[PDB]
Curated annotation (Swiss-Prot):
Domain of life: Eukaryota
Source species taxonomy: Eukaryota, Metazoa, Chordata, Craniata, Vertebrata
Record remark: domains: The N-terminal 240 amino acids are sufficient to mediate complex formation.
Similarity-based family: Belongs to the DNA polymerase alpha subunit B family.
UniProt-recorded name of the protein: DNA polymerase alpha subunit B
Post-translational modification: Phosphorylated in a cell cycle-dependent manner, in G2/M phase.
Included stretch of the parent chain: 1 to 78 of 598
Oligomeric form and interacting partners: Component of the alpha DNA polymerase complex (also known as the alpha DNA polymerase-primase complex) consisting of four subunits: the catalytic subunit POLA1, the regulatory subunit POLA2, and primase complex subunits PRIM1 and PRIM2 respectively. Within the complex, POLA1 directly interacts with PRIM2/p58.
Protein function: Accessory subunit of the DNA polymerase alpha complex (also known as the alpha DNA polymerase-primase complex) which plays an essential role in the initiation of DNA synthesis. During the S phase of the cell cycle, the DNA polymerase alpha complex (composed of a catalytic subunit POLA1, an accessory subunit POLA2 and two primase subunits, the catalytic subunit PRIM1 and the regulatory subunit PRIM2) is recruited to DNA at the replicative forks via direct interactions with MCM10 and WDHD1.
Places the protein is found: Nucleus
């Protein structure tokens, strides 16, 4: 069951979040694993990209985003 990469990609184009399809699908995997809407996965990632100053994203940035924000607040682990 997917969160739909084509709906997530429409938000990345507003904020200038440069990703390939393999990095767009990485946030779809988080939306599906966490049971969470993509406006969180796109919106909270901007703060991380601002703090690193990076204009483009990597397989390392979207891997670290799980530990930088998502695992810190998870309700399923309580």
């Amino acid at each position: 069951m997917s969160a739909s990469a084509q709906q997530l990609a429409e938000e990345l184009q507003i904020f200038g979040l440069d990703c390939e399809e393999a990095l767009i699908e990485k946030l779809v995997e988080l939306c599906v694993q966490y049971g969470q809407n993509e406006e969180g996965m796109v919106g909270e990632l901007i703060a991380f990209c601002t703090s690193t100053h990076k204009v483009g994203l990597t397989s390392e940035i979207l891997n670290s985003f799980e530990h930088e924000f998502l695992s810190k607040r998870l309700s399923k682990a309580r």
